[PDB]
Assembly symmetry: none
Homo-oligomer: 107 residues x 2
């Protein structure tokens, strides 16, 4: 089962800052990593597909990069509405497995 380690666990910034969230796979999964946001009492929302492709309708401030085993999510200039947990997901090999999550707090 491919394992996904996210970092950090939590982080705090004020609005306007940039943040990067990392996710590493225990083996090469190529570009087959998706990133999701989930705010409390909400279903997950897909931000990025295939490591670096953004979804129609999500802000240009989200982007991703990476391939093989190291992947990062960037939010350039976070907004207060970005307060959420973010997790990665591999779709390379079943069972499809998820990172443990990163809490973004916007102080």
């Amino acid at each position: 089962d491919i394992e996904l380690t996210q970092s950090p666990a939590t982080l705090s910034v004020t609005p306007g800052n940039s943040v990067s969230i990392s996710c590493r796979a225990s083996q090469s999964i190529g570009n087959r990593l998706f990133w999701y946001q989930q705010k409390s009492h909400e279903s997950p929302r897909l931000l990025i597909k295939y490591a670096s492709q953004s979804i129609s309708g999500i802000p240009s401030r989200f982007s991703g990069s990476g391939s093989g085993t190291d992947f990062t999510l960037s939010i350039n200039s976070v907004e207060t509405e970005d307060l959420a947990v973010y997790f990665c997901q591999q779709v390379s090999e079943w069972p499809f497995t998820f990172g443990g999550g990163t809490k973004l707090e916007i102080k």
Copy 2:
């Protein structure tokens, strides 16, 4: 973490047949289990909340049951439009873990 195991990985049916998808928690989580459907690389659609409460307006052929460790999503009379990957997520204790997914294939 509370681990969720989903079964099967994929299954195949012909339209009109009935289908059962399972998701097992390693520890008791009562009714605290959400089911999702994803028809493509997109944000998940929430089908069932709290094990067995169907979301207003989803087809009546969908239902969920279970409380504790053993959860079942049932589609009673599949339509070809139901081709998707289904996931369960527990929402009982952090981190809110996900099953490995099940791909419904329609002969």
